[PDB]
């Protein structure tokens, strides 16, 4: 329910999470024990027409929690998190031989 | 792989598609052969530079194609397509036995 | 799991269902969404008392549900349903070449 | 073709067999070597309209023989066997510690 | 024993069947219930030298029957069928949304 | 995959190959390294135009290669090769104990 | 959760059960229908520091019941059961040819 | 196979091991290479005499070895080891974000 | 190494064992605990030409022991055992319902 | 399945076959096509009477066929075949580098 | 294509790589980010007789890259690498609890 | 497992074998039974001392044996064997149809 990427540019650690149709009130980005990024949530039920006929349902998301061990304790007040076009983004600012023989 | 739901309302058949990270300029919504809904586009890979370092990669990228066969009598000229929060929505407007023994 | 046969006569489509041990008060035969035959009911489990002792149990019990899509032009008001000897029967009334080259 | 249950109430041994659509002339309940209940048979071909179109056929029963070893020699004249609603029923009348160490 | 292709050019439906070493007296192309093409047959035994030694035998064809549901009732007198170079050929003559959001 | 049989007559070793839809201009019959029969060619794919529509495709196309090792003493200069009705034929001309106890 | 051994010395039947970290108030040794030894129980939750961090947990025991059919009705008042070093012990006191042809 | 848990308290890392039927004289607790906890010993097989008869054998016997890597800064001289009720315990003393974007 | 059959004629229990190339000094038929027939042995090494070339070896027999529980204690002095044509033979002399309901 | 060994002596190629329970009148030893040793026969099934009762059946019965290709120069007229103790024997009479670097 | 061993003697880290038939101009030993040994290469095509007949080819090596994380930053000028008898060798010079209870 | 190639030149059959880390004193090249090339030897394991520590082991050691059947007419007395760079080389000196239809 949350395929994620983790990239380390020289300037910061950038995490991406595919969370299509999720609202910020349903996602949570926290930091634990100084160096553990935590991403969790649960896409709400679509308050769509009760009585509709469901021909096919592939999109089936649920609760989930993910954790990553940062290489260095993060300055929590500098961590940025944005949700856009179904993608959550968490940015964490960082501080030849010769053969013969 | 674009996940899609197919629901039916009294007024129309509604299709949903998870397309996180896709801008409306990368998605195409059409009707082929007169009655085949075709949802396609590309989830562009952010190749970037070699200065970067990847610690985890789970998100997919590339081309996606989805086809549904609409009714021979569907408001093909009235199909709407909306894209918000990584979710695409296509609206296709529509034209007790008593046991013996 | 209720086993069902689907045969077609010049006059109607006939459905058969093995429902051993089911009284007609436990079976329901309907037509949903205008053209979907729905056969459902329950094969009640004879729980009994603890004085009893079971040496073998192979027979199933519980709920069963079966759906067939009838023709958009079927005598929906003329569907009959009979139950005898553990078999349910539903009657849905209906509205050479030469080689060479 | 003959899922069966065997229950032992204090009063007798009760066997059940799902034989939907079977006629008594097609089933046989015998007793062998004093303590062996034997159930066998074969559902006859439905002498239904020769020429019918078979859309779907799940109900496919054939010949079969089953045997159970009774705990005590049975009084064959007291054994009752009835067929109803596709279910064959054969009734056979019968005659803390302390831890420490 | 009869790998087949089905192509629909604007002018007609063209079926191909690999029937190597088969003679027209062994193949049959019929039409059933107005819209069902039927191809069947059985390659005859090669009346070759009785007593020959069979080192290796891969070519092992047998009886077979195939059916296709035509999109429209075919005019049986217009259906052409030819056998040549092991290939049977049956020809059947026929008669952008702008994304909001 | 070209299916081939290998039979032996008092006069010669006979090879058969199913090559439906192959013209004699697309098949090659040779003898390599002095004693290796090589049957090869191509089953050309009828690509055609985009106006067409494919409903079924089971027939293969492309290159095929088959090799058999003949006898060090075989009429290599007398090998014949015939092609008819999708079947290729290659003719390679050829140069009781009583139990005791 | 209760690997057990059953040894029959001439003097008695000896059963062993690995029940590490289990307290007698959590294990039960009973005798049913005269000749059926029954061993059951459930290791209690370690009332250890609520809040501890669990790095690795392999020891994961739960509820269980085991039964053995004694060769002879046991004198229940003579059955001894002791728990020591994680091992439950239940003691039940008991009362050539020539070839040629 | 000795099952072990690894928990961490504010004061120390605690290890547990199921060792039913093992006397403290058969268990060894050490620290190798300066920081590797090594728990090993043997669960002696009670071979006995041939007068005996085995009806069931599920309990294992033989040698067991377990290794955990402690911290380069752990009270290696303050490690305690207790054994009671078939369970070994080793005590190794120790030295939200906003979404928007 | 000893495929065996066990037949019970009214007169006796007859066991057969395929022991090709085995000599009586290599087979053993015993009786244990009054009612347990025991067949064991081991085909000796063929004292054939040391230095021979072994192209193919399928016949590969070894040690084996088999036991059967007789229905009645056998009179050991009456048990006959003969070896002939690779077959060991051990002979042990012995002493409808109505449906309706 | 008749198990056979194939050994070679300076004087001849020797074949062995396990044929327990087979009389020399049921075995046939021949040489087909001039150089193919053919060992065949039948291990007759002792059907017997219905008075009998089978408790175990592991021995096979029926036809067996074995073929070995002898040398184009083998004493085909001098092949012997012996049968004893369930084993068939067929005797087919026969017509250091120094590492540089 | 490069099975490797890594041994740590007190004096240094010794890596071995089976690179049969490889020339030093085809192998590369580098050091990255201070503590990462890297071994890569590709055995060249044997400039042997173009036209030769290949009966059997098992030796099939290709491109490859391997990396190991050294325990300590290596002094690159002290790293020795020799190729001999198909084996690459890379040498990297380095700088009881009493049970209570 | 010694990987070997078998190529044929107009002058001889050439065999190659990957034998990294094997000195010519550990390899043996012979011709058994008059026409069987036998390449064998041992890849000695460098057991060493306990002061050492192994972090990775992928290279194999032990005995290896390879056999190829040469021609009944091969220069058995002219076979050469060279060993260089972990590769062993053994040199064994050697003594269009028009399609009708």
From Swiss-Prot, chains A, B, C, D, E, F, G, H, I, J, K, L:
One of its GO terms (biological process) is response to hydrogen peroxide. Residues 1-101 form the sHSP domain. One of its GO terms (molecular function) is unfolded protein binding. Keywords: Cytoplasm, Stress response. It is found in: Cytoplasm. It comes from the Eukaryota. One of its GO terms (cellular component) is cytoplasm. Homododecamer composed of 2 hexameric rings, each consisting of 3 homodimers. Belongs to the small heat shock protein (HSP20) family. This is 16.9 kDa class I heat shock protein 2. It comes from Triticum aestivum.
């Amino acid at each position: 329910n949350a395929r994620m990427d983790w990239k380390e540019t020289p300037e910061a650690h950038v995490f991406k999470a595919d969370l299509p149709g999720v609202k910020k009130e349903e996602v949570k980005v926290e930091v634990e024990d100084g160096n553990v990024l935590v991403v969790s949530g649960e896409r709400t039920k679509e308050k769509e027409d009760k009585n509709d006929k469901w021909h096919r349902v592939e999109r089936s998301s649920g609760k989930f929690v993910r954790r990553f061990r940062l290489l260095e304790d993060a300055k929590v007040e500098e961590v940025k998190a944005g949700l856009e076009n179904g993608v959550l983004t968490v940015t964490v600012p960082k501080a030849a031989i010769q053969i013969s023989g």
